[PDB]
């Protein structure tokens with residue numbers, strides 16, 4: 001009632017801004033079971049449900065997001081220099097599909113602003129991480145950058161020391177040429193540079209490095225990414241970003257808007273990409289599963305397919321804050337029904353049957 005009112009009155013971008021403000025001010029029951037704890041990426045996670053990148057692009061609402069019940073928070077994407085992103089309108093709801101299309105184009109306050117914001121709460125975060133509530137930082141590249149690898153390297157040096165993990169986002173559909181960085185040769189060069197930069201940070205400031213990939217890759221592209229990840233010792237994968245596909249059956253009036261599609265229509269394309277990447281990496285590379293999670297069943301499907309952790313965003317825009325607790329409670333119930341001792345036991349379970 002209260003959320004749909006404000007959202008019917010506001011365009012989606014305005015609603016997003018209000019949600020970030022409300023969350024940041026802490027204007028918002030479930031106590032996490034031991035069954036939901038996961039140890040991965042060199043950290044304890046109190047529960048495996050995180051907020052996906054894009055909700056808190058500029059690191060303004062981190063503490064409010066933990067208050068909402070997320071086991072981990074990812075901020076970004078952050079670009080080196082501030083930039084405005086694409087012209088409006090750039091976000092569209094597809095209510096009949098429980099989906100969103102966005103073409104933000106990496107609107108970002110930039111590394112310096114975000115650095116200072118995170119520094120203001122750096123020791124608070126250190127305590128939260130120790131308590132099982134880690135922080136990830138997702139890095140992008142500026143529109144007019146002439147050297148993509150140097151943009152990512154700048155991000156590692158500036159925000160790496162404030163993050164438990166960093167994400168090399170090479171899968172936004174809304175920056176020209178970006179997804180080409182997922183190609184074997186480009187990815188290997190880029191990731192070598194990123195990992196060199198990371199390894200140069202002092203030990204207590206040295207994050208894990210993950211790569212976030214698209215749902216629209218060819219089988220060759222996926223095989224290539226798996227090979228590079230193993231070759232270089234990349235710490236994990238985030239699977240997946242939004243899709244440039246438009247699955248048959250979309251009903252929303254705005255289905256043919258340009259941008260990345262998220263929410264329910266992405267769900268099974270993302271799950272199958274998790275499944276493939278888990279197999280190609282022999283289950284040895286942690287995966288954060290994302291795309292269309294709005295229930296415990298959705299979360300458990302991704303975990304059984306190979307995800308160690310999951311994230312959501314689009315479900316929050318339809319169902320609000322209560323969806324977080326709902327996913328967690330449902331996931332715990334399913335784990336019990338299916339005879340798992342906890343989340344850890346379920347990771348990759350479909351591959352072992």
Ligand SMILES: Cc1cc2nc3c(=O)[nH]c(=O)nc-3n(C[C@H](O)[C@H](O)[C@H](O)COP(=O)(O)O)c2cc1C
Nearest residue numbers: 052053054076077240241262263291292312313314
């Ligand atoms: C409005 C919006 C903005 C997004 N911005 C980013 C971003 O800056 N960086 C990123 O890696 N992913 C971004 N994403 C992608 C999401 O993190 C997530 O991969 C995708 O939306 C699928 O999850 P969902 O179906 O639960 O929303 C964005 C998604 C939405 C809906």
Ligand SMILES: CCc1cc(O)n2nc(SCc3cc(Cl)ccc3Cl)nc2n1
Nearest residue numbers: 006007012015016018019022316317320
């Ligand atoms: C895709 C841009 C967008 C749009 C939107 O209504 N929301 N809503 C959220 S969180 C849900 C929420 C909505 C409102 Cl209006 C106020 C508080 C909260 Cl938590 N994030 C959003 N992001």
Ligand SMILES: O=C(O)c1cc(=O)[nH]c(=O)[nH]1
Nearest residue numbers: 104105106172174242260
């Ligand atoms: O800024 C955006 O347009 C954005 C980035 C990204 O990685 N994914 C997405 O769907 N939108």
Ligand SMILES: [Cl-]
Nearest residue numbers: 122161162205
């Ligand atoms: Cl520091």
